[PDB]
């Protein structure tokens, strides 16, 4: 085997998607049990965006205002109501594909699979990590709006991104399935942009981690440093503190290859300092970071 | 905006995946209306795939030397048949998530998702392009074999790799739908080796205006090239000679972005002479191949 950076098969959430229009605005909506959840400014036009007052144009609407569309069949709006930044829609026909699921706001650095969707069709499945800043650098075209990014444990979807919006350094913000927007961003136009980001450092220790799992060890030294000292280092390099927690994070995989987690950051120390010298870790010249210890452990593992 | 390296959604293959066993040895089958397919390396023994003789081995065989399982559950084999490198399993019962779909057999250079599959189970997706060596950089651990590469157009899923193994650096070999190998690999413990690859030059170009496409242009420059020059260039970074056919697939990208096919061709050469500079393009740092024009067209907006 090689090491690649995968989504989860996306059959469980491709049965969930539909298409939810109101007035001359399409996007996507996340259908489970009777309810489609969607981005409540799939109520606005053009104007609308500059500030709406989504209260009092959601009072202008009635259920007949919502046209939902499941494949070739069009659903029917029986009660709809906002929850934060979604709108969520009653229908009268319970998704009879709804997979065992699960809501869930996830952590800056963790990493999730984004079904791209348009018109309520799924059209490509990648992964992608929450940045640090908030922002996911994604792949998205008009109309992707109510797209979703999730992870699967087992049998169950954990439902974790709606897509909303593209912000002016064509990164994308979205909120988690109760509608609240991940970082300060709003679904409104303002001047909003994107603070500075930085590399997720417990990410690429754990894909370090992976490298030695596979053979890749060229890197590795007889040193250690303090947790200070690194976090010296790595913030000149724009890598984000690394925290106690994120040492203990990384102990199952620390335990797995022996190698304690302060050991490896001397190496990685040594890397950001003197580079690669030409060499690659995994077949790549750079360092990577959107893999979590979690998704390590569950790929070097054949997890299915 | 964004561009990045994504997959077909996998929902009508991961319908369509089952396990099969034959003695001691399980792996992925794909099972079809009535029909189930796998490698028939699925008979073979640890000493048998030394030098095996398909013909001698599965003639004695019968139908209830196979089971297959879609999950949990049996399905009884009614018939088998070797077609090339695969095995065909007829089994009683159709598959209801069987969608339309069609065997196709790709060029070197084209890309398409691959479901990888352990025990007739998903695992994960995800995108690759087939090695103008007829490799595929896939990592695929033991017991992947059987996992299938698709495409996907409208509703009809085009299948088009099953995976059969892997070679000495670590790359993955396999075969169409119809069990032909791509490449000159054979289904058996040998000393077959990957032949020499190239970076396949078409792609890069359709990555370079995805870059541009995307609001990023400073690798640009006002020269211009012919394609023999460009070629004489590309060729001693190891590039894929390119074709006017070639020139001619990246038409509608020049047209979108206003840019001339040789121009692109002259950055492409200026930045094989000179490098990146610490610069990156659509935030690699590399010069990427993994995306034909069709993909790019697919992805960016229009």
């Known amino acids: 085997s090689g090491f690649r950076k995968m989504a989860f098969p996306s059959g469980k959430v491709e049965g969930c998607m539909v298409q939810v229009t109101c007035g001359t605005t399409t996007l ?103 940045r640090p800043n908030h922002t996911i650098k994604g792949s998205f075209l008009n109309g992707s709006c109510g797209s979703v990014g999730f992870n699967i444990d087992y049998d169950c979807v954990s439902f974790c991104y709606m897509h909303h919006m593209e912000l002016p350094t064509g990164v994308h913000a979205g909120t988690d399935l109760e509608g609240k927007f991940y970082g300060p961003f709003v679904d409104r136009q303002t001047a909003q942009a994107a603070g500075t980001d930085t590399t997720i450092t417990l990410n690429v220790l754990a894909w370090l981690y992976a490298a030695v799992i596979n053979g890749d060890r060229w890197f590795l030294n007889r040193f250690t440093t303090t947790l200070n000292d690194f976090n010296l280092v790595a913030m000149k390099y724009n890598y984000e503190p690394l925290t106690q927690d994120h040492v203990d994070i990384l102990g199952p995989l620390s335990a797995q290859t022996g190698i304690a987690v302060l050991d490896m950051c001397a190496a990685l120390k040594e890397l950001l300092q003197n580079g690669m010298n030409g060499r690659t870790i995994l077949g790549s010249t750079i360092l990577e970071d959107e893999f979590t210890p979690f998704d390590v452990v569950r790929q070097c593992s054949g997890v299915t």
């Not at 065992?100 to 499945?125: D, E, H, M, W």
């Open 28 to 130: 996507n909506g996340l259908w489970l049990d009777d309810t489609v959840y969607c981005p409540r400014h799939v109520i606005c036009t053009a104007e609308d965006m500059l500030n709406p007052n989504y209260e009092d144009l959601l009072i202008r609407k009635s259920n007949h205002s919502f046209l939902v569309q499941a494949g070739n069949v069009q659903l029917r709006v029986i009660g709809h109501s906002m929850q934060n930044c979604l709108l969520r829609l009653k229908v009268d026909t319970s998704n009879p594909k709804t997979p065992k699921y699960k809501f869930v706001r996830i952590q800056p650095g963790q990493t999730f699979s984004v079904l791209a969707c348009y018109n309520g069709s799924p059209s490509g499945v990648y992964q992608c990590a929450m």
